[PDB]
Design a protein that fits this description.
This is part of a larger assembly, with 2 copies of chain A. By secondary structure, chain A is an all-alpha fold. Chain A contains 2 helices and no strands. The radius of gyration of chain A is 20 Å and the shape is rod-shaped. Chain A starts with 9 loop residues before the first helix and ends with a helix. Chain A: It comes from Salmonella phage P22 (Bacteriophage P22). Chain A: Belongs to the p22likevirus portal protein family. Chain A: It is found in: Virion.
Amino acid sequence: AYYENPEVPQANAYMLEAATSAVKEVATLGVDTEAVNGGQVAFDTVNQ
Amino acid sequence: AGEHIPIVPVFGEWGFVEDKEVYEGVVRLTKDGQRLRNMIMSFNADIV
């Protein structure tokens, strides 16, 4: 007979999906460029 | 000094419910799904 190991709970796994999704929302600023402005204009305009 | 009131309110999306004014950002019924998405997340936090 063989020992069944923890496969990591589906609860823990489903929570990790919501964990990784939480961080990447606010990372986006509306930016679509490799330089200033481009939908991040709000941050750059208050600097100037 | 002015001959008219020099304070002008702006509004995002403006209109009448029927008898009185109502106005909203973009955010009005956004809050419904956002707090919901958090509920499901935080319920699984207990299981972790």
